Amino acid sequence: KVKLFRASEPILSVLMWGVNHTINELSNVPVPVMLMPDDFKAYSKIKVDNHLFNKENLPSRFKFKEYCPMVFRNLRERFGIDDQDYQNSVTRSAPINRFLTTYDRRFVIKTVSSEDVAEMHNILKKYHQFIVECHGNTLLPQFLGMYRLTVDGVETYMVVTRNVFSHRLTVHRKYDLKVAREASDKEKAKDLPTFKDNDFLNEGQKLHVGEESKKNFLEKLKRDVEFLAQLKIMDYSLLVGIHDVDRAEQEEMEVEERGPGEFDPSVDVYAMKSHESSPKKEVYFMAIIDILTPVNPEQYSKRFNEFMSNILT
Amino acid sequence: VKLFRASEPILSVLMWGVNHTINELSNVPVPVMLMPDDFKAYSKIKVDNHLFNKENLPSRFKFKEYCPMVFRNLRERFGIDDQDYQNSVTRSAPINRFLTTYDRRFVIKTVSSEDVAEMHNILKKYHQFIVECHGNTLLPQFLGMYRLTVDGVETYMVVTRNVFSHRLTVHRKYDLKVAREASDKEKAKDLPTFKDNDFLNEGQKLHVGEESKKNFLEKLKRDVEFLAQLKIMDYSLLVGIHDVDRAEQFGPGEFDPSVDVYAMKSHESSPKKEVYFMAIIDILTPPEQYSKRFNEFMSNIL
Ligand SMILES: O=c1[nH]c(=O)c2ncn([C@@H]3O[C@H](COP(=O)(O)OP(=O)(O)OP(=O)(O)O)[C@@H](O)[C@H]3O)c2[nH]1
Ligand SMILES: O=c1[nH]c(=O)c2ncn([C@@H]3O[C@H](COP(=O)(O)OP(=O)(O)O)[C@@H](O)[C@H]3O)c2[nH]1
Ligand SMILES: O=c1[nH]c(=O)c2ncn([C@@H]3O[C@H](COP(=O)(O)OP(=O)(O)O)[C@@H](O)[C@H]3O)c2[nH]1
Questions:
Q1: Which segments cross the bilayer (chain A)?
Q2: 3-state SS class at A180
């Protein structure tokens, strides 16, 4: 039962300790009837100064701050994420890759600017109830936690989201779609490049999901980017992952020498199966990302929606 | 849900702090042995909440535990499970500074800065005496030592196992240590602490018979020869008497010796059926002669 918080760097140990600690405190806090305005301006702050004690993995001195814990707990709940699962995913073993995932690939942890933390506070009330009015059915990021760590007198802000991609299905190709953008010769020459818009268009890539899931994708995309427009938010992207079922079947068999294309929508919430009659059997993951940025937000809404409308069939 | 609801905020912080430190310790491996730094170590946490979890706890406070590895090991050597200790402090607020936990199992005394200094001065030798006597001792059994900061004022606390039983009511109490006696004021409280000379003027005796008298004296001698060899004085032996018959006015005179470690049955040849509780207390403020005189006084009570 013993959690050592062993990690390759001390800040990950503090992250694990911090999520463990804050979730445990939260378990002794009743779940409220409703959120109250103060919950949107609240925070928890702990400062640890140990001496000759418990130094094998944690630093002796550090600080941990969690922003709006009542709100983000309610968000976890509205996204179907149990608190015990959340803490287990972060603390059973050190996150990996700044950008991290939990070891089980379920949650993504991005470090962010002080400005991003400002913008989250500014949008949080309206974001919380956009989530509530759409019952968690959205392609926007699903924010589960926001934290400030202090190790060596240095502050680091982190935002936790649900992974856009599946936690079990491999992603074989990825795009960040939003002028003109493309992938660097450096980026294009790496294990899994992030192809931008114009490499999607030069490839002639198409995603065949058939009518019903095309329609529910476009309906939630319109609702989502009208929300971000009405919040004067820009520079966001749609992140797109392609899972080639057949290639996965091969790669598994190749490690076996030394279901298939099936997934749980309650967990892989951005995932879509390819249409019955489509050249290859594929799974797609598509979500809106990078929404904490702030030329026109209405224009951004319309242009972004037209492009993403056209990547489907 | 542990709300830490308490009669004053400092008790809430005490409950929170013991809960937190015990949970952290469950993530610290039990070492093959204690090391010298464990006797100089401490845990310190500082809480600054804002608009959050303020219904029972204060928003800002500090909690420091002294030598947590050492006191965890002492808990183990006294047969006290960590989660039981935590439950006794946190399941419900301590009561009546001098406190017990809601279940009356552990005593929480507020102490001086100097007492914390002195405990540090004796701690290694005290731990070694605990290991050499296998927890079989009439000394105080220290389970934790903490410093709380609430409203910028520090409060030091030491947790001991209760001398008295946690279920059997104590009907008369004596503090045996010149000449000392109980005040007219104390003599009018509900349960006076009758001091040495009122025990003698009362003619009270504790009949435990030969078998149980002998190694009570053996352990008393071992203990205060230890405290002499540590130059400790001004300590007392505290003694409680439980009369079964008044209790009658699901069993009487019944107790678990594994829990009420200082308890003794009255001898068959004793006028009334009684339960006695007896241990050494107040051993923290810093000659040899005291050892012999104190041991002699306690010697003549069987
Ligand atoms: O609009 C907001 N409503 C809020 O309710 C709120 N709460 C925090 N913040 C943000 O926090 C950022 C830096 O971090 P932070 O201020 O959390 O550190 P701090 O003030 O506790 O300590 P320190 O930096 O002096 O050591 C600040 O620039 C603010 O953007 C908020 N912004
Ligand atoms: O939920 C997610 N699951 C992922 O698996 C994932 N991978 C990347 N991203 C995002 O895409 C951009 C980085 O792209 P990148 O080119 O790899 O790195 P950077 O753009 O900073 O140079 C940033 O928005 C990243 O946070 C992901 N989001
Ligand atoms: O383990 C214990 N269980 C007890 O139930 C208990 N009751 C009293 N004591 C001690 O006896 C002296 C106070 O006696 P007191 O006369 O009531 O108060 P004070 O002497 O401060 O005026 C101090 O050493 C007290 O901590 C107890 N120790």
A1: none
A2: coil
Query: Looking at residue A190, what DSSP letter applies?
Result: S
Residue with tokens 């994420």: A81
Taking residue A146's Cβ as centre, other Cβ atoms within 10 Å add up to 23
CA B23 to chain centroid, in Å, comes to 22
Q: Is B176 exposed, middle or buried (0-12, 13-18, 19+ CB in 10 A)?
A: buried
Q: Which residues contact A305 (CB under 8 A, 6 or more apart)?
A: A221, A222, A225
Is the CB of B69 inside 8 Å of chain A's CB atoms?
Answer: yes
Q: Is B9 helix (H, G, I), strand (E, B) or coil?
A: helix
Look at the alpha carbons of B32, B35, B37, B40 in this order and tell me if their dihedral is positive or negative. Answer: positive
Helix axis angle for A69-78 and A83-91, nearest 10°, is: 100
Q: Which of B57, B60, B50, B48 is nearest to A42 (CA)?
A: B50
Contact between B72 and B126 under an 8 Å Cβ cutoff? The reply is no
CA B75 remoteness from chain centre:
12
Closest CA to A35 of A98, A5, A77, A87: A77
Please state, as a whole number, how many other Cβ atoms lie within 10 Å of the Cβ of residue B74. 22
Q: How many CB pairs under 8 A join A and B?
A: 77
Written as one letter, the residue type at B300 is: N
User: What sign for the dihedral angle of Cα B78, B80, B81, B82?
Assistant: negative
Report the Cα B91 to chain-centroid distance in Å: 19
B7 touches chain A (CB under 8 A): no
- Determine the residue type at B175: D
**Tokens standing for B213?**
């008298």
Task: Give me the phi and psi of B100, to 5 degrees please.
Answer: -120, 160
Q: Which residues of B touch A24 (CB under 8 A)?
A: 23
Q: Can you tell me the distance from the alpha carbon of B92 to that of B4, in angstroms, rounded to the nearest whole number?
A: 7
Residue A226's Cβ-count burial label (10 Å; 0-12, 13-18, 19+) is middle
DSSP letters spanning B252-284: TT---TTTSTTEEEPPSSSSS-EEEEEEEE---
Please choose from A41, A117, A148, A154 the residue to mutate so as to test ligand 1's pocket, defined by most ligand atoms within 8 A of CB: A117
Q: How near does any CA of chain B get to the CA of A27, in Å?
A: 7
**Nearest CA residue ID for atom 25, ligand 1:** A155
A41 and chain B in contact, CB less than 8 A: yes
Q: Which of A206, A208, A207, A205 is nearest to A275 (CA)?
A: A208
SS3 call for B302: coil
Q: Is the Cα torsion angle A118, A124, A127, A131 positive or negative in sign? A: positive
In which element (H, E) is residue A171 found?
Answer: none
Resolution in A: 2.6
User: Got the DSSP string for B145-184?
Assistant: EEEEEETTEEEEEEEEE-SS-SSSPP-EEEEE-------T
Which residues lie closer than 8 Å to A246 by C-beta, 6 or more apart? A280, A281
A127 vs A120: CA distance, rounded Å: 9
